[PDB]
């Protein structure tokens, strides 16, 4: 009969938006059977108090799925762990909205967690397809190492093995290091001149100001950086001509909620038409039984999707994070962010705007040297 779908949103207004979206989704296919009520809660400080709130405010109403969101004020120092751990005990699926850290891409830790954005590792796939079109082969990978280097570098290397071309010396550095010029000096005397950067926000600023003092960006030394490398520190600590990347939607939580409920509502009632249906446990305390139909709900929700909404066309992959995303190629020209192209899928589409390379040489620089 009545089913519930919880949510953990950022601000008060987003709760109203979620309620409006759930009402709209209910209004479409509500021919008896389901009514699809909703339950709400807001982000709270600390972390232990949060994991307790889920057990007494959300799980206490038989929630078929929890819906996380990024906190408004703080940075990624408080990415939502407790919801995944607490709800993961009963194998209750949780849908992510704007969480990108590449640690949830595996299921060894987060048993049941699937998002709607390619977190950070899929940026490596662009590096392959973008490199072919602009005629450069040999690369050097300059990456950090806390967890991104173990994943972002690994994905590119294993994907480039199909071409039988291997990357050059893949160096690394400890997080939050200073005077990295000794490590960079080893890279200075090498072959490839297409150095790829992929690190954290604070870390990337250190490399930029250090590389300037070593005259490593004057001509024919192209750069390639991820979304976070450019971010908000490109105003006063960046060279001229770094080709970054930016997600087309990103921080647009208003649109994602109107489509996150568009896939859950489609899949909840499909499961409701079946033989063995079991509701989830009523209370956290006193129960230690796994939700029997939990694995079934996770499987069907991961495969079908296909809800054609405002964010494009959602289609989850084999392990979580949604595939087929719309990227956009940035560029830096006189401290500006003019667009250069568009990535839709498996093919980069250039534009009619000429670009400027690091040195003003309006041409295709030779990577080999």
């Amino acid at each position: 009969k009545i089913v519930n779908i919880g949510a953990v949103l950022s601000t008060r207004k987003h709760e109203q938006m979620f309620r409006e979206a759930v009402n709209q989704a209910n209004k479409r296919h509500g021919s008896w059977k389901i009514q699809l009520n909703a339950t709400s809660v807001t982000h709270k400080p600390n972390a232990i108090q949060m994991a307790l709130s889920v057990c007494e405010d959300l799980i206490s109403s038989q929630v078929y799925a929890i819906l996380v969101s990024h906190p408004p004020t703080p940075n990624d120092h408080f990415t939502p762990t407790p919801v995944s751990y607490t709800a993961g005990f009963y194998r209750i699926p949780v849908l992510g909205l704007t969480t990108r850290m590449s640690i949830y891409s595996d299921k060894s830790i987060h048993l049941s967690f699937l998002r709607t954005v390619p977190p950070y590792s899929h940026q490596s796939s662009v590096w392959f397809e973008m490199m072919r079109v602009y005629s450069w082969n040999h690369i050097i990978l300059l990456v950090s190492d806390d967890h991104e280097g173990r994943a972002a570098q690994k994905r590119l290397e294993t994907l480039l093995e199909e071409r039988e071309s291997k990357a050059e010396k893949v160096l690394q550095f400890d997080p939050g290091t200073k005077n990295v010029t000794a490590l960079l000096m080893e890279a200075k005397e090498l072959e490839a001149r297409v150095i790829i950067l992929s690190a954290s926000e604070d870390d990337a600023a250190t490399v930029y100001r250090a590389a300037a003092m070593l005259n490593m960006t004057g001509s024919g030394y192209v750069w390639l950086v991820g979304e976070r490398e450019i971010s908000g520190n490109a105003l006063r600590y960046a060279p001229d001509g770094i080709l970054g990347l930016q997600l087309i939607n990103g921080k647009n939580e208003s649109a994602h909620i109107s489509d996150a409920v568009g896939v859950v509502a489609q899949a909840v009632h499909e499961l409701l038409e079946k033989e063995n249906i079991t509701d989830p446990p009523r209370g956290c305390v006193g129960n230690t039984n796994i939700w029997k139909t939990g694995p079934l709900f996770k499987r069907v929700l991961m495969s079908s999707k296909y809800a054609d909404g405002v964010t494009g066309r959602v289609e989850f992959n084999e392990d979580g994070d949604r595939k087929f995303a719309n990227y956009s190629i940035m560029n830096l020209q006189n401290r500006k962010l003019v667009q250069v192209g568009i990535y839709n899928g498996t093919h980069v589409i250039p534009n009619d705007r000429k670009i400027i390379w690091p040195g003003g040489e309006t041409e295709k620089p030779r990577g080999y040297q």
Partner: antibody
Amino acid sequence: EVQLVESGGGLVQPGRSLRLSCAASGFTFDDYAMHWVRQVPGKGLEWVSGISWSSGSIGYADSVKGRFTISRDNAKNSLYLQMNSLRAEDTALYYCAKDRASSWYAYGMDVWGQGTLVTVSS
Amino acid sequence: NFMLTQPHSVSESPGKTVTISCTRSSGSIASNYVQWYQQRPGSSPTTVIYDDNQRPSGVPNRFSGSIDSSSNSASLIISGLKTEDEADYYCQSTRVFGGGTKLTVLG
């Protein structure tokens, strides 16, 4: 552009069977579900059945249930409606329609087909 | 279920505004959506207005939506124009279609 083509119907004696065919062109065949809406001469329209984007979500009307079956193939962009044990009151045209979402639950439809003709009589 | 009803026919000389209703049998009309269909005789039905008050790409505006509750009904409001657009209409909500009314221009 988007266009739906269907045919393969004619007068059939009562108690026999038939199998129409509806083919698509243009729009992607794997992204949108399709229905089967039938008219009635003189009177209004009515609903018959529907098919999901791939499979699994199959719906039927009241009298339609059990008598007819519906299946689709994603390779050659075709839609099939298999029926048997027709009656005298099932004389009408039959239209092919394409939905808007990836499922038949919304009951929405746009870009209708061109119709056909099937009649049951002695 | 229910039964959707509407007036049998309507006529109007060009220039003024025509009104077509579609009355719900049981339950609130706002519980589910409403859409209308445009079909010329001998042709195939095509969508004119869908999802309460919206127009698909190609509709020349003019036609407007109205889900005013009143006595549990839903009307169709069209601005003043006749031209060659005068034929039968159907209102569909969920698995059910309307009786069908036609627009007869006055000559």
